[PDB]
């Protein structure tokens with residue numbers, strides 16, 4: 067008892083809202099986490115044989131242009147100067163990526179100036195304007211033209227979504243920078259880097275406040291009925307799956323899940339870069355991570371003749387999988403609305419708020435989760451405390 | 452005796468020694484600069500029509516792994532987070548550069564793995580071991596193999612030096628990182644970036660001390676007899692050309708000089724990157740600079756539909772020219788040794804010290820000029836000014 071707030075989930079959304087209540091409002095918070103560790107998908111740990119820091123839940127690369135979010139996270143960890151770059155493997159060649167003069171030179175066979183390249187892509191993309199694009203395929207072609215779409219977007223998306231590119235959200239592809247220069251940074255944000263002391267350390271520092279206690283290995287849906295009887299005093303922030311909150315009363319929301327197969331190899335360097343995208347259908351995995359390259363400043367502590375790689379696979383979320391991505395087909399989006407009604411209803415009736423990637427069925431990055439958490443705290447939780 | 456110290460030349464070397472005497476030893480310093488501005492080849496200024504900062508003596512990019520140098524320069528200017536990357540234009544294609552998996556893929560036509568690339572380059576470099584490579588051609592081939600050498604080094608080098616690569620220093624090519632991964636940073640140093648407020652501001656801050664007076668438009672060899680009458684006590688640090696100092700007694704050292712064509716173009720972006728190398732003999736210039744891409748953090752101040760470029764041309768230094776590079780052929784290294792002897796004698800006899808790219812005939816980057824000057828101040832001038 068004595069708890070002012072209950073947060074369901076110790077992911078970044080759950081941790082920010084809890085940390086803000088604790089240090090800004092001085093309220094005692096308890097976070098209920100189902101897993102054996104803090105941090106949700108942002109969690110990382112060292113690989114036993116090599117000591118290399120692994121994102122066991124997918125490559126986690128922090129980037130933001132939100133100054134307020136940047137200053138905030140920098141309270142809990144320093145960040146390296148790492149800048150994410152991705153190469154795209156297609157028909158036996160590693161391509162500069164995303165769209166820029168480098169990829170354009172490599173794929174079309176000669177150098178195009180910025181002006182010449184703008185003209186080239188204008189021609190190949192003419193079949194649809196960006197204003198008229200309502201899904202992933204129309205939008206992609208509109209931004210990068212037909213041939214680049216068919217060569218670098220089609221098969222990849224098929225593997226990542228196993229879904230008709232004509233019903234997936236346009237916003238999925240606008241995640242990637244589209245450029246007419248040689249800049250091949252995978253993100254275009256003001257601030258980015260990796261936690262200097264690793265993710266795990268970062269996330270713990272966040273939860274480290276004395277008005278916060280974490281109960282790991284604990285399922286909310288089990289302990290809720292008494293715990294909030296022990297404390298009808300505390301509001302609840304739920305960052306678990308939405309459709310699961312209401313026991314699939316309206317059905318199952320479409321989610322994608324990922325699998326990670328880790329391999330320790332007898333070479334110091336497998337692919338010479340942190341992430342290689344596999345854009346061809348013949349390769350079952352979407353990309354390969356080589357984690358030693360995420361921290362070149364730890365070179366002296368990495369083994370000289372071993373490396374850990376991880377092949378990443380995508381499939382539909384089955385019950386028992388962690389959902390990683392919302393699919394948000396139009397068919398999905400309807401079901402989503404019905405749950406939103408229910409959700410709205412629950413927050414007033416039962417003082418339960420719905421946040422985070424899983425809580426709102428939204429394709430959120432870390433900095434987006436944190437911003438959305440900051441918004442909920444300032445706009446809602448300040449009142450209800 | 453209005454001056455405890457006289458410095459010839461206001462390049463980074465000269466500004467460093469002057470600033471240290473001024474702030475660390477409380478000594479009055481005179482810097483004689485021959486040019487109309489201070490800072491030597493690191494000088495920059497805004498282009499009138501566009502306002503874009505131009506490095507007027509060739510693109511200047513600061514990089515170092517020397518922590519003492521880094522902390523020092525950061526007293527006079529902050530630096531951006533910019534990282535230099537260079538692309539190499541060859542047979543109508545812009546290649547990732549210097550050697551990495553990117554260049555190897557593009558030039559050889561398929562992806563090579565790090566291990567495969569190591570084996571591929573091991574084969575192509577078999578004709579010479581790096582241990583036995585004693586000139587530029589041998590060293591380049593030993594490091595990146597014959598085919599990459601002939602496509603990306605030979606012709607560029609020909610334009611830039613106009614000298615048999617078998618007579619050029621091996622050290623010229625080892626300036627470039629040789630990698631078996633996808634990292635295409637042109638430098639591999641711990642610290643790098645651009646002066647946030649430009650080079651001119653940085654260099655002015657260095658010279659901005661009440662113990663320092665700068666005389667521009669002044670040639671040391673013309674004012675020398677008078678200046679050394681009015682302050683016969685003061686040591687002199689000379690950072691001008693070594694062989695000119697002794698009136699070419701031992702002959703002419705080989706030097707290269709540069710010429711630049713600067714052009715304002717009616718487009719917002721000419722080449723999508725700050726430096727494009729032109730590795731083919733068919734282009735008379737060695738590279739093209741597009742200065743706006745050095746400062747993307749100034750995007751809001753850049754014109755939307757204009758850009759300034761600069762084409763760089765190389766030739767031998769003749770009597771009217773400022774020398775930009777030492778050539779250091781074996782014949783040059785002989786002559787140099789003789790000038791070193793003279794210089795040594797002069798330092799004893801006339802208390803004249805010799806420093807910097809021109810003063811010592813060395814292929815020095817900015818951080819090396821500054822490192823060598825910090826060293827000279829501590830190790831020679833503290834003593835000499837006691």
Ligand SMILES: Cc1cc2nc3c(=O)[nH]c(=O)nc-3n(C[C@H](O)[C@H](O)[C@H](O)COP(=O)(O)OP(=O)(O)OC[C@H]3O[C@@H](n4cnc5c(N)ncnc54)[C@H](O)[C@@H]3O)c2cc1C
Nearest residue numbers: 075077078079100106107124127286306422423430431432
């Ligand atoms: C493969 C992948 C790569 C990514 N890469 C990046 C990137 O490069 N850069 C970036 O900025 N973002 C990235 N992200 C996004 C980032 O992982 C998430 O957006 C962020 O973690 C979202 O925060 P969240 O709190 O909403 O989600 P979550 O981390 O999923 O929070 C859920 C937590 O609540 C717990 N929980 C669920 N149900 C219960 C329950 N019933 N009881 C108790 N606890 C429960 C879960 O165990 C989990 O720990 C990536 C995501 C993935 C999947």
Ligand SMILES: Cc1cc2nc3c(=O)[nH]c(=O)nc-3n(C[C@H](O)[C@H](O)[C@H](O)COP(=O)(O)OP(=O)(O)OC[C@H]3O[C@@H](n4cnc5c(N)ncnc54)[C@H](O)[C@@H]3O)c2cc1C
Nearest residue numbers: 460462463464485491492509511512671691807808816817
């Ligand atoms: C095209 C080019 C690009 C370069 N790019 C980089 C880079 O990207 N990064 C990097 O770290 N370094 C770079 N450098 C190297 C850089 O220029 C040198 O490190 C630096 O200029 C050396 O400083 P310095 O003081 O020793 O010599 P200088 O800069 O040559 O200074 C010598 C000064 O002495 C003056 N002087 C000569 N004679 C007299 C006289 N008789 N009387 C009075 N004054 C005289 C000269 O006018 C000059 O101002 C580049 C050089 C060139 C040519």
Ligand SMILES: O=c1ccn([C@@H]2O[C@H](COP(=O)(O)OP(=O)(O)O)[C@@H](O)[C@H]2O)c(=O)[nH]1
Nearest residue numbers: 154218219220222223226238239241343345
């Ligand atoms: O090589 C690529 C990279 C991305 N995408 C598309 O762009 C979306 C977002 O890409 P991101 O790299 O942002 O995927 P995440 O890291 O979020 O899984 C993916 O879902 C794909 O549909 C693609 O088709 N090919």
Ligand SMILES: O=c1ccn([C@@H]2O[C@H](COP(=O)(O)OP(=O)(O)O)[C@@H](O)[C@H]2O)c(=O)[nH]1
Nearest residue numbers: 539603604605607608611623624626728730
């Ligand atoms: O595309 C290139 C780049 C460099 N070099 C060789 O490497 C030396 C050093 O190159 P840098 O880029 O350091 O030249 P700087 O910028 O000092 O003129 C040059 O003199 C050439 O001999 C070359 O042959 N081709």
